[PDB]
């Protein structure tokens, strides 16, 4: 579902923000 | 029409119109018919310029007269006022009637049993007699029609402003159209009256 794929993507972006802030 | 001297109003004709009440039209005025109206009274009933009625009635005659074989003026009533009048008109005039339940495509289908290809139609109430009117636009068929205030003037080439609602006025109009197609051309004086009674043409709502 589109809406949930957005949530998926916004959570995964959130994980990427978090990985990169380790450097 | 040329209400010029011979074929003018006269008192006796107007008094018949008034009795039938062909002047006393309806409540719903269509913007095409505005042309043919004096006023609206109290309550809400329009009144129909009886001169204007005459003129249009005369025109229709000159169209039916120009039809060189009378039998190829078709004449139609779908309603149960005109069915008798259109039949008596056709007898008087020498026309061909189509009284009642007009079969879709009498003017189309080469194939059909009841195939006819007339040069003119003469409708009663164009609101009800609507299938033939539309078929009169697949064949190149001009038209006469006894129109009330409401009656919309789709396809009708020459409208006669009447009280097509009341059976009396309907009958009266048919009998008038007969007189003048007879008088123009045929075996009637104009100075003398006509042997035929207008009561002949009226619909009989089961009485006896």
């Amino acid at each position: 579902r589109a809406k949930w794929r957005k949530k998926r993507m916004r959570r995964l972006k959130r994980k990427r923000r978090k990985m990169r802030q380790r450097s | 029409s040329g209400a010029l001297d011979v074929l003018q109003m006269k008192e006796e004709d107007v008094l018949k119109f008034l009795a039938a009440g062909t002047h006393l039209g309806g409540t719903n005025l269509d913007f095409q018919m505005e042309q043919y109206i004096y006023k609206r009274k109290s309550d809400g009933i329009y009144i129909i310029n009886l001169k204007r009625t005459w003129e249009k009635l005369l025109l229709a005659a000159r169209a039916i007269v120009a039809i060189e074989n009378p039998a190829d003026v078709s004449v139609i009533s779908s309603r149960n006022t005109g069915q008798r009048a259109v039949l008596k008109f056709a007898a008087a005039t020498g026309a061909t009637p189509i009284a009642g339940r007009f079969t879709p495509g009498t003017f189309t289908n080469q194939i059909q049993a009841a195939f006819r290809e007339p040069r003119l139609l003469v409708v009663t109430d164009p609101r009800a007699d609507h299938q033939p009117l539309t078929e009169a636009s697949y064949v190149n068929l001009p038209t006469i029609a006894l129109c009330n205030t409401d009656s919309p003037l789709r396809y009708v080439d020459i409208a006669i402003p009447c009280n097509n609602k009341g059976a009396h006025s309907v009958g009266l109009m048919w009998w008038m159209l007969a007189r003048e197609v007879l008088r123009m051309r045929g075996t009637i004086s104009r100075e003398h009256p006509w042997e035929v009674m207008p009561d002949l043409y009226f619909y009989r709502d089961p009485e006896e």
Partner: protein, 83 residues
């Protein structure tokens, strides 16, 4: 229709609505040429010759034919001053 020589051409010359100069087509099957009879004057009584008017298929279906016809008559002195 004529070519530069003055010699006419073109396999016919269409009718053209009396009420709109609008050329009535080869296959406009809702058209009308309407003959309206004249009279002798002294007696009424249909007098041989006609008055004719063609109308385009469009005008009819527009619902404007009877007014237009009524207007054409009263130009040509068939009808007599409705007012």
């Amino acid at each position: 229709m004529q070519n530069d020589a003055g010699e006419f051409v073109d396999l016919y010359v269409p009718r053209k609505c009396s009420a709109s100069n609008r050329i009535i087509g080869a296959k406009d099957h809702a058209s009308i040429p309407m003959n309206v009879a004249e009279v002798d004057k002294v007696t009424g009584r249909f007098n041989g010759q006609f008055k004719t008017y063609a109308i385009c298929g469009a005008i009819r279906r527009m619902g404007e034919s009877d007014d237009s016809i009524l207007r054409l008559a009263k130009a040509h002195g068939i009808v007599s001053q409705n007012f």
